Design a protein around this ligand. Structure first.
Ligand SMILES: Cc1ccc2c(c1)[C@@]1(CC1(Cl)Cl)C(=O)N2
Ligand SMILES: Cc1ccc2c(c1)[C@@]1(CC1(Cl)Cl)C(=O)N2
Lengths: 124, 124
């Protein structure tokens, strides 16, 4: 069974949506990919809730109460064979001086939520 | 850009965790796969929050406030090229007499949350 670590991010207060998503896509992602490769992450997915997606979400959620729509700006998902892969990555001294400080440039670090699940995957 | 429809499920009241996850994995999934194939869904992921994953989640979320942990029993994610793929699936008359009724046998249908996002994916 593969596992999934999900991180639900609220953007940095008073950062623009454009600036948030550009930072996430263009800076955070290349900074993280080497670590994810090194530590054996199987799949990494970045989900964006912005002006592009919002009409699509409004269509999918038509007829739903607004409170039943998730508000997070960005959601990151890391799929791994074992959580030791993630914990080892997180304590890597390079990670501590690259990825950790970078969080403060895009996330409201008072508000992050997370989960850990086991998954089933299907492709067609 | 691919899109992701995420569905956050709370189990049916008083249904056991074991009964919930067995139903989702063994019954709902084979019922959904034909529709997902037909309507051109690219990837379908089912995330489980149960006795197997919970010690793994507790380790990943060590030092986090309990309120910062997502509590959904099951999370479904459908990745598509366009939301019309999903909307057409959902109105398929076969879907209406198979997948829709089956929801009541595993989900608390007063409480489902959802989102629609645009995604970036990386494999290693
Ligand atoms: C937004 C965010 C909040 C908390 C944590 C992270 C991001 C990390 C770097 C990853 Cl993504 Cl693993 C972590 O170690 N904890
Ligand atoms: C738990 C749940 C709640 C609402 C909806 C669904 C599941 C569906 C069948 C899918 Cl998964 Cl597309 C739908 O049409 N709306």
């Amino acid at each position: 069974r593969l596992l999934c670590f999900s991180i639900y991010v609220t953007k940095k207060p008073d950062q623009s949506e454009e600036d948030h998503h550009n930072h996430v896509s263009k800076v955070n992602a290349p900074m993280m990919i080497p670590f994810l490769k090194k530590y054996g992450i199987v799949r990494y997915t970045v989900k964006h809730n912005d002006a592009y997606s919002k009409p699509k979400q409004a269509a999918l959620m038509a007829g739903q109460p607004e409170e039943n729509v998730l508000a997070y700006d960005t959601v990151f998902e890391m799929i791994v064979k074992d959580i030791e892969s993630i914990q080892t990555m997180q304590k890597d001294e390079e990670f501590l001086r690259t990825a950790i400080p970078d969080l403060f440039n895009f996330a409201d670090m008072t508000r992050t939520k997370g989960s850990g699940t086991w998954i089933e995957e299907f492709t067609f």
